[PDB]
């Protein structure tokens, strides 16, 4: 059994009182549901509030979320209930706390007294042009343009950050990553770093865009999109490591799916569309985070169906990972804590096998390990194809799910 959820959004900064304080209180409440993980934001000084625009990586205290004792002490009320606590790791690109005699800000400082992380140019990728002196590899991945591209190539800064990490995990209390900008560098690089920390998991975002067309919607057909995500895995590892990936695919195709075209759920090969219905294993779903969703609503989830998006995932293969807001804010709490209910009561988990039954435009049927049956859509009746023995179990606006 295994299920993550994401512990804040991108207002998350501002909280009164301190973020972390307030997760404090959130603990026992998602314990209860059934998570395993909890996904953390960058814990440390960022230039930017909400931890994406990391400067002083040791310097936690500086952190809008909170200080070191207020972080430590989330993790372990966590630890306390079971649930690992996975840390927002972002490391493509990284700012520089003073200028150099160019007046370019470039010279880093890691946050403590000797001179780790106490990088200078030399450490940053060449051909990001603003910030390099030309005297480093070029970058091994995509370009952040508001901040210094890390070389990671360069040996010292493979072994700092690794260290970093092997910290974060020892006096902080971490368990696992998530990679932010992971399209940022390779997955070879990427590889290094998961190897080097051993951690409990290591789920990267690596978001690329979908194929659409002429009137914007995703296309039907989205291998592509999902074997470039199997390709990072790996490239990574595969099943020797623990790196895994957030299922754009299925979040891009289910956003379209729920909009009256259920029939986008299945591929020809009658398996899932995402990266679910190939590696199940290795894919995080979701129905939306702090970038898609939120107050950043960069793709957002059909707002009026929200539940059939975590009926969904929560009772299918892959990873399921319940979004902040929906558990608490919008008032599913009880919709979604009872759907994990039903998906451990039955001990499903992510290679469950999927047996779809209906891709109708408006109504999308599927039983999982033959024990759970669900329903999305605007059709009323799909009695024809439950089983036999199957009861109605939980259910809620075009939604509803079976077990026997
Ligand atoms: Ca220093
Ligand atoms: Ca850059
Ligand atoms: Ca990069």
Request: overall charge negative; charged content about 20%.
């Amino acid at each position: 059994h295994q299920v993550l959820f994401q512990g804040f959004n991108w207002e998350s900064w501002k909280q009164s009182g301190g973020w972390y304080n307030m997760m404090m209180g959130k603990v026992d409440d998602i314990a209860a549901a059934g998570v395993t993980h909890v996904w953390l934001p960058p814990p440390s000084h960022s230039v930017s509030n909400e931890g994406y625009m990391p400067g002083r990586l040791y310097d936690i205290d500086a952190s809008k979320y909170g200080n070191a004792a207020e972080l430590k002490s989330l993790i372990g009320a966590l630890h306390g209930k079971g649930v690992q606590a996975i840390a927002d790791i972002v490391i493509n690109h990284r700012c520089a706390d003073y200028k150099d005699s160019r007046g370019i800000y470039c010279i880093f400082e890691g946050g403590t007294s000797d001179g780790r992380l106490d990088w200078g140019p030399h450490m940053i990728c060449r051909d990001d042009t603003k910030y390099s002196d030309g005297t480093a590899n070029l970058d091994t991945g995509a370009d952040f343009a508001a901040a210094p591209d890390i070389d990671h190539l360069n040996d010292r800064v493979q072994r700092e950050l690794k260290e970093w990490l092997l910290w974060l995990k020892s006096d902080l209390g971490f368990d696992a990553w998530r990679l932010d900008f992971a399209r940022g560098y390779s997955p070879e690089m990427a590889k290094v770093y998961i190897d080097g920390t051993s951690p409990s998991l290591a789920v990267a975002e690596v978001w690329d865009n979908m194929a659409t067309g002429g009137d914007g919607k995703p296309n039907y057909d989205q291998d592509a999109h999902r074997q470039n995500l199997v390709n990072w895995v790996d490239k990574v590892g595969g099943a020797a490591s623990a790196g895994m990936v957030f299922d754009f695919t299925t979040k891009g195709i289910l956003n379209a799916a729920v909009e009256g075209e259920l029939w986008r759920l299945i591929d020809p090969q009658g398996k899932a569309p995402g990266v679910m219905g190939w590696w199940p294993a290795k894919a995080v779903t979701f129905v939306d985070n702090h970038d898609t969703g939120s107050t950043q609503a960069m793709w957002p989830f059909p707002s009026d169906k929200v539940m059939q998006g975590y009926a969904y995932i929560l009772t299918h293969p892959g990873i399921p990972c319940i979004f902040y807001d929906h558990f608490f804010n919008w008032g599913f709490k009880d919709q979604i804590a009872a759907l994990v209910a039903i998906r451990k009561r039955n001990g499903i988990t992510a290679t469950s096998a999927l047996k779809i039954l209906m891709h109708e435009g408006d109504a999308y049927v599927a039983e999982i390990d033959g024990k759970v049956v669900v329903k999305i859509g605007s059709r009323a009746d799909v009695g024809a194809v439950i089983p036999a023995g199957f009861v109605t179990s939980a259910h809620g606006n075009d939604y509803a799910v079976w077990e026997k």
